[PDB]
Amino acid sequence: SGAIYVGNYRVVNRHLATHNDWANLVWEDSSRDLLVSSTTAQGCDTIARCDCQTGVYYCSSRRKHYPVSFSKPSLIFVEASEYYPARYQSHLMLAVGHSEPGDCGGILRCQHGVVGIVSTGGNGLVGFADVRDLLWLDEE
Ligand SMILES: Nc1ccc(-c2ncno2)cc1
Numbered sequence: 001s002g003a004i005y006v007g008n009y010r011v012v013n014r015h016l017a018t019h020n021d022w023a024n025l026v027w028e029d030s031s032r033d034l035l036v037s038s039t040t041a042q043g044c045d046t047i048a049r050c051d052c053q054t055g056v057y058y059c060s061s062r063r064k065h066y067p068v069s070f071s072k073p074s075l076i077f078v079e080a081s082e083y084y085p086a087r088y089q090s091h092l093m094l095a096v097g098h099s100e101p102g103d104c105g106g107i108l109r110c111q112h113g114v115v116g117i118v119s120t121g122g123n124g125l126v127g128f129a130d131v132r133d134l135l136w137l138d139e140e
């Protein structure tokens with residue numbers, strides 16, 4: 001589990017979004033596994049605006065942060081999940097690391113701020129849904 005809180009926005013994994021998230025829907029992309037909902041309370045997170053390919057992510061199944069190298073956001077085939085059919089995910093970044101289903105929502109960060117959230121795992125890879133292109137998260 002996990003979310004990003006920036007301005008009046010909450011960013012979550014689309015497959016973990018709550019009924020309240022859906023009732024307060026701002027934007028969702030199935031192909032990205034992202035949903036953004038509106039919040040009453042001001043969020044304190046900063047979104048990275050950069051092309052970093054290194055950062056640190058939180059891994060809840062290890063209670064650890066890991067430093068990783070990751071690929072630039074791309075269209076990647078992702079195997080079966082209990083929350084998706086075997087499908088193409090877009091804006092996905094892969095690193096070598098540990099990810100289990102409950103690690104989704106873990107934040108990947110660089111010096112510039114939040115890069116993305118854990119979205120995919122298995123076969124010793126961790127996949128992160130990028131948010132850096134969503135420039136609209138940093139205004140109204
Ligand atoms: N192989 C490494 C080493 C360090 C980092 C890192 N430090 C801070 N943010 O990333 C990433 C990958």
Ligand SMILES: [Zn+2]
Nearest residue numbers: 050052110112
């Ligand atoms: Zn960066």
